Design a protein around this nucleic acid. Sequence first.
DNA 1: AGGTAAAACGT
DNA 2: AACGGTATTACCT
Length: 202
Amino acid sequence: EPLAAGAVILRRFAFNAAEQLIRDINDVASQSPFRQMVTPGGYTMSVAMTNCGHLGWTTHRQGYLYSPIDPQTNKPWPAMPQSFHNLCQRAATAAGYPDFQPDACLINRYAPGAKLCLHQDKDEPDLRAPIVSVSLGLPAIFQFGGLKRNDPLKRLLLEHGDVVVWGGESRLFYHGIQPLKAGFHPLTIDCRYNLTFRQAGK
DNA sequence: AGGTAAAACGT
DNA sequence: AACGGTATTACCT
Ligand SMILES: O=C(O)CCC(=O)C(=O)O
Ligand SMILES: [Mn+2]
């Protein structure tokens, strides 16, 4: 059974690339550090975030926004690493989205207890483009639902190297991550990373 | 008129 | 602890 219409999980797809990906996460973060963003309502997110590529996802007083500038450094987000771009292209192709051209990569870091409550990815103007989501390090339970928040959820464990792609009919589906269980991973030690690639501009 | 925050407490 | 209320509103543009 496939994940959903237009959605697939490619288990361990990024396993072989993982060590290089993690080195490049560290390189990106050395320029635009991980930070826990504050919601418009004033709550600090448990996930720590940074971005690379032309556009980075951020919170603002006024809402959510894709911006070419890191508001913490006041400099452009770091360029998207070639390792990221290549892995993304290969995964998108395997998932049936060969033409995907991301201009944005959000890097999520989960410490024990960190979560991402059910939400839609909808700040992108071109919804024809899929989301490509790469898991690294400790395992997490990914929720994948429907167009409505109360639509029944699938819960899938995402392990190191797993890639999830959604788009088309499932592009706007609600999804999230349940509070991260503590553990050990030889490459990330005590955390999970996720890379989410999007076409956020035009 | 439409977009939209909640990507965030009680049972 | 899985499910669902809340935005059933108050602001922007
Ligand atoms: O960490 C994940 O697997 C999901 C991340 C996510 O939903 C997002 O970046 O919008
Ligand atoms: Mn998301």
